Amino acid sequence: MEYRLKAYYREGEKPSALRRAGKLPGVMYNRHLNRKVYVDLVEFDKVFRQASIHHVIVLELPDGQSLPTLVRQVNLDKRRRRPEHVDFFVLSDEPVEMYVPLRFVGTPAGVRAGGVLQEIHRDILVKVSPRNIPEFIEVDVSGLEIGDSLHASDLKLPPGVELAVSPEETIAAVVPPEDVEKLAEEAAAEVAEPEVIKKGKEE
Amino acid sequence: RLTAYERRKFRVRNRIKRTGRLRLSVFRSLKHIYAQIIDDEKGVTLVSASSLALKLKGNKTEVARQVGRALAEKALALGIKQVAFDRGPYKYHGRVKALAEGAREGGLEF
Amino acid sequence: PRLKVKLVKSPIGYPKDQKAALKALGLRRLQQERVLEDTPAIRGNVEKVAHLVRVEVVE
Amino acid sequence: AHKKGLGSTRNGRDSQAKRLGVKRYEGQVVRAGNILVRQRGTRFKPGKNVGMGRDFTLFALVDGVVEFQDRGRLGRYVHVRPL
Amino acid sequence: MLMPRRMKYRKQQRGRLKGATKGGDYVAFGDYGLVALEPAWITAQQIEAARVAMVRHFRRGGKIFIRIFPDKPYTKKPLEVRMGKGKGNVEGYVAVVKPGRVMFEVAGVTEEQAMEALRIAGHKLPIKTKIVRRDAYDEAQ
RNA sequence: CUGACUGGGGCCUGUAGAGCACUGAUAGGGCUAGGGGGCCCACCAGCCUACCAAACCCUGUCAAACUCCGAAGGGUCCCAGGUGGAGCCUGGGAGUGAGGGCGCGAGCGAUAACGUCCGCGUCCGAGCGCGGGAACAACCGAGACCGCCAGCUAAGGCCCCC
RNA sequence: UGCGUAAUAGCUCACUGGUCGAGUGGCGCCGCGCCGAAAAUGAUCGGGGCUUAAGCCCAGCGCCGAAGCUGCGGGUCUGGG
RNA sequence: CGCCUCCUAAAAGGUAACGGAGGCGCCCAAAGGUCCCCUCAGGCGGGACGGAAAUCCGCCGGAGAGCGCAAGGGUAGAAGG
RNA sequence: CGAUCAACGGAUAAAAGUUACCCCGGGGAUAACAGGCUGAUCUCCCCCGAGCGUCCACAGCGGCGGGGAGGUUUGGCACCUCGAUGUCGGCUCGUCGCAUCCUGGGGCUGAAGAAGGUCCCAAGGGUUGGGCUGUUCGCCCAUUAAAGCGGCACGCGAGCUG
RNA sequence: UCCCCCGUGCCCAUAGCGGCGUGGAACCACCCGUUCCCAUUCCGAACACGGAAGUGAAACGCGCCAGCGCCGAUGGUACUGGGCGGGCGACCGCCUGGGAGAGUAGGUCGGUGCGGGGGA
Numbered sequence A: 001m002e003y004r005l006k007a008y009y010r011e012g013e014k015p016s017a018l019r020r021a022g023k024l025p026g027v028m029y030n031r032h033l034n035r036k037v038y039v040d041l042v043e044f045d046k047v048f049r050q051a052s053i054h055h056v057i058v059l060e061l062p063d064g065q066s067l068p069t070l071v072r073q074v075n076l077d078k079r080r081r082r083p084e085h086v087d088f089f090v091l092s093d094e095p096v097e098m099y100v101p102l103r104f105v106g107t108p109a110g111v112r113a114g115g116v117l118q119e120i121h122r123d124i125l126v127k128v129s130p131r132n133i134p135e136f137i138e139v140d141v142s143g144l145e146i147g148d149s150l151h152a153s154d155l156k157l158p159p160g161v162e163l164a165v166s167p168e169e170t171i172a173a174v175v176p177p178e179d180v181e182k183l184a185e186e187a188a189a190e191v192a193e194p195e196v197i198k199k200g201k202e203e
Numbered sequence B: 001r002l003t004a005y006e007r008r009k010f011r012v013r014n015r016i017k018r019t020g021r022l023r024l025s026v027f028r029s030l031k032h033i034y035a036q037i038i039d040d041e042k043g044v045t046l047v048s049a050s051s052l053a054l055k056l057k058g059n060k061t062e063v064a065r066q067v068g069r070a071l072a073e074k075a076l077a078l079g080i081k082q083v084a085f086d087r088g089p090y091k092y093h094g095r096v097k098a099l100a101e102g103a104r105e106g107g108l109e110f
Numbered sequence C: 001p002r003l004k005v006k007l008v009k010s011p012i013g014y015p016k017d018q019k020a021a022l023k024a025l026g027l028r029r030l031q032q033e034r035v036l037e038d039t040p041a042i043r044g045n046v047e048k049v050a051h052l053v054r055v056e057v058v059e
Numbered sequence D: 001a002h003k004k005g006l007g008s009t010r011n012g013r014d015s016q017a018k019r020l021g022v023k024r025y026e027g028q029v030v031r032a033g034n035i036l037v038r039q040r041g042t043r044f045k046p047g048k049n050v051g052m053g054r055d056f057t058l059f060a061l062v063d064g065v066v067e068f069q070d071r072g073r074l075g076r077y078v079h080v081r082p083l
Numbered sequence E: 001m002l003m004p005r006r007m008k009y010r011k012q013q014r015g016r017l018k019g020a021t022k023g024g025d026y027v028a029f030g031d032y033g034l035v036a037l038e039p040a041w042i043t044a045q046q047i048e049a050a051r052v053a054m055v056r057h058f059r060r061g062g063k064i065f066i067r068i069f070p071d072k073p074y075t076k077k078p079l080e081v082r083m084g085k086g087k088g089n090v091e092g093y094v095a096v097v098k099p100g101r102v103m104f105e106v107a108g109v110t111e112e113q114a115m116e117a118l119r120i121a122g123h124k125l126p127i128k129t130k131i132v133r134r135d136a137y138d139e140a141q
Numbered sequence F: 001c002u003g004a005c006u007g008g009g010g011c012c013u014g015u016a017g018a019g020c021a022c023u024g025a026u027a028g029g030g031c032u033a034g035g036g037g038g039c040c041c042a043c044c045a046g047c048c049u050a051c052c053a054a055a056c057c058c059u060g061u062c063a064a065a066c067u068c069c070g071a072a073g074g075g076u077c078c079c080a081g082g083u084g085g086a087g088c089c090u091g092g093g094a095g096u097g098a099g100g101g102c103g104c105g106a107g108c109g110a111u112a113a114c115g116u117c118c119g120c121g122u123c124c125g126a127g128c129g130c131g132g133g134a135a136c137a138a139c140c141g142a143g144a145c146c147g148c149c150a151g152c153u154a155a156g157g158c159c160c161c162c
Numbered sequence G: 001u002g003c004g005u006a007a008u009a010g011c012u013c014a015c016u017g018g019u020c021g022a023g024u025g026g027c028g029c030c031g032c033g034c035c036g037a038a039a040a041u042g043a044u045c046g047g048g049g050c051u052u053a054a055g056c057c058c059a060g061c062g063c064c065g066a067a068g069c070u071g072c073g074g075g076u077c078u079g080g081g
Numbered sequence H: 001c002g003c004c005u006c007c008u009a010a011a012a013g014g015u016a017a018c019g020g021a022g023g024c025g026c027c028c029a030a031a032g033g034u035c036c037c038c039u040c041a042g043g044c045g046g047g048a049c050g051g052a053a054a055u056c057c058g059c060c061g062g063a064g065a066g067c068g069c070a071a072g073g074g075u076a077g078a079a080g081g
Numbered sequence I: 001c002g003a004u005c006a007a008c009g010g011a012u013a014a015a016a017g018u019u020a021c022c023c024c025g026g027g028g029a030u031a032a033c034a035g036g037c038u039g040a041u042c043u044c045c046c047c048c049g050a051g052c053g054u055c056c057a058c059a060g061c062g063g064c065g066g067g068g069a070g071g072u073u074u075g076g077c078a079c080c081u082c083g084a085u086g087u088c089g090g091c092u093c094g095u096c097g098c099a100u101c102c103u104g105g106g107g108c109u110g111a112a113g114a115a116g117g118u119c120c121c122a123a124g125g126g127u128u129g130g131g132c133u134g135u136u137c138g139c140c141c142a143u144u145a146a147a148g149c150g151g152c153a154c155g156c157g158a159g160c161u162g
Numbered sequence J: 001u002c003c004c005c006c007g008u009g010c011c012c013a014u015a016g017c018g019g020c021g022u023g024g025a026a027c028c029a030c031c032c033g034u035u036c037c038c039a040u041u042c043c044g045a046a047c048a049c050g051g052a053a054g055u056g057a058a059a060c061g062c063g064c065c066a067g068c069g070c071c072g073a074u075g076g077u078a079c080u081g082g083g084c085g086g087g088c089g090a091c092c093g094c095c096u097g098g099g100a101g102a103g104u105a106g107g108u109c110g111g112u113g114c115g116g117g118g119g120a
Ligand SMILES: NC(=[NH2+])NCCC[C@H](N)C(=O)O
Pocket: J080, J081, J093
């Protein structure tokens, strides 16, 4: 979909003051503009948990302007697991690199056999027109056993969208599951002591 | 990847420029020979001479020698006397050597 | 203009370079006031001991 | 009472500190012979009016003013500008 | 259980434990994570008890990701000796963990399965913990 | 007048943090020599692996003796402020060479010790003089020349002991 | 779904029908508290005693308080007269 | 128990512990002076005996080789041959 | 030129032991006792709930791990005491803690009864006599409602023993 | 003073790798020879000399391209000099001044000094 988010301008307000008033600080940029912004945290969080660098967010500004952006970067407070700053990338008419959600259709035969589908990439990096952004990219994984894998070279891309990663990059795999029957093997598995790399006259 | 040519040139010339004298640089093409006296502190050439610019005759070795005399005569009229010879990538031999001998005959001190 | 500098908190227990800063300002007793010219060199010592001192712009 | 036996340490050695480093910084007036840098190898190279000793020591060849220059891949140099 | 196969040095100084975790603060692999809420040296024994507790709750199925590794040698002098006579012997290995670090992630399993396995695992660790679920914030990292 | 300290300017540095490009460590996946095993074979090849796995790649990390990076500061020189129980020179007289607590930075110890060993600072030592902290060398307040039945404050307090 | 039998049967959860008439159930974060809390002569926050505090958090005004500072008088040394 | 290298050492210098790791008590008549010349390890492909690795050829390859010996610094625009 | 003067600033050219037969000067600058600080070790109590218990995680149990308390063990440290703080065990005389051995009151039980198991409340009183050994402890004999465990300078030598 | 080339410096990859295109009148190179100077641990490959038929194939120079490499903000954060608080601790905050690294946007297929030859 196409989400909307009120944004506001900030000059010399201190980020800790804005964040204490419930406002997430941010920035807007492309080759033409660079402006210090802030959004409302609860408002931004409602949108971002859905939009999430994948779908377009339109920023309604206080001067009346509206600008179509991709979230380019989210900085998290490593202690509290909270966003502390956003980068809004203002889209132009030229193509753009971006991540399109991968969507894994079907149940693998390995998963039926007891396995686990490891979704290695959940989106994929890609150049596409900002008027061409597909909602997702379907991938058939129903023929993967334990342990087969899928790569970006197996992506059936919609029209207008070019792969921006190496075709040899792994996107999914189906791996063996955890098994209690292996525990007693691993428990009674003696692992020898670490070797210390020879130093000096002995090497 | 430097060539043996570029290594030879750098090696010869670093040693020359360490002594702080004006260098007599010499470029030897298949056809012609050239000379500049260079102040490396200013990065500036003070006096030149070459077969191409004097439209000189046939035998490359005697041509080289005459180029040296020519360089000397113009050098002394500017006050230049002492100098350091910059064989660059060439052996001190033949055409280069002749140009050096020709410079010395003209009173360049080296 | 000038700075009126009042020593209001004791330097006992503070590093010696802060004690020296007070000597450079000529401040040697508590509640003592000095009116000093406002140059960047005098101001650097006033700021150095700002947590000990009370400043006012004058004249 | 019950005091347990001990081992020992195979380490415990270290050499004397060698007091290396730059000895005159840019803009200092020096006399010919003044040592400018003490170093292992050519962390600094000799420039104009600066010699180098058998242990890579950099010293001034003339009275003047020390000047440093960083020339990228060519290294960092110490010069002495005559007064 | 986990420990380096080789090392350049047998014994490490102790260092400090200040600050939030350096990296590894977002869910990178599985669906749910167990986040450290306070610093500690997590022992290789503790990680293995945490891993076995999740495997046993899953019985058969799922995938566990252990995102910390105990590479720091832990040293203790022999009992009843006095101070001196050199550094103690290596008795074990620990992983340094600081607040915000995602220690374990699970995948291939229901939400109720993951919540409960990460809870039982957390009871084996010497610190408070949080259970998290992969977010858009995690994906944008 | 050169001092501590301070302003400006230049040069030196590899710590905090961070990073993974080097030296090592490292979970998983991919790719893939070499082994384990399984069909097939001895006639020399061939296929198969939910096995261990080098190199390489991806994702994600670790390091006092790792660093592609890299602060705050620190050091030093120049010019300027700085007249202070400042500084410099010569010489006479010493005492001290058992320190200790606390804060911060590390090592050792057990992310023990009124532990121990260094670094920066501080106080006690020598301020066991004064106010606060119930009492209490080093925590907070503050540097006691003498006198006053005067006033303002500091930390801490303002129900009674008070 | 839980309880039961060796099994059985059961009562029941999820569940749908009626009565009632407006809220109900489940997570998560913050402040302050509760348990977890056993040691040796007699107890106690320094004591008394304190509960819209005499406790804790936020915002104030006033006062008390030292050998610090001021006022007044004096000594001595140093510097300037 | 003297000496060297790294770390501890808190980005100048210096800095302790029966703290963490290694080395020295030689050597070289060239492994010294100077002049001239030359450029590595490694990967891939090709080549009798000949091999993971002998010597040869081609391409890639800035320094990961080398520098008598520990470690560190330095270093091919040579300190290496 | 002659130095493993290598204890490497190198006392002589030339040098090892022993003392419970010992002596003097000193030190709580430094050990053994006891205290103190600490609590690794020790003792006790908890968290988690794999798995046992025919069935059933929790009657009784509790893999791998996790958090504490106490200050009775062995130590760490070296802070008062070396111009002396008598040191094991016993006897005598107690007094205190309660993590309770018995007696009193309880809940759960895989409690039919009787007898047990386990946890909770409870410190009022009680908690035997012998054989061995210096013993503390422990084992054993015969009983008992029970034959508790700890603190008090491992309580108590200006109270005794030795 | 403008454009091309040849020397020779400076900045130190925004200058490099790769791909493509282009240049021989001039210059440069390959080239033609090995008598002569000089030369090969063998080799005229190199070094060197004497040349001038050819070719810009190699090299070099000059363009274009952003796959790699290199450079890289703004914003925010870590950390921190100085000043204060909190926690039994491991550790955690506030003020004031300073402020990364990674990453994002984006930049880059160089710029410039001196002399010489040619051109307009
Ligand atoms: N320059 C500074 N402000 N330094 C502050 C140091 C960090 C401080 N301990 C804090 O977390 O608040």
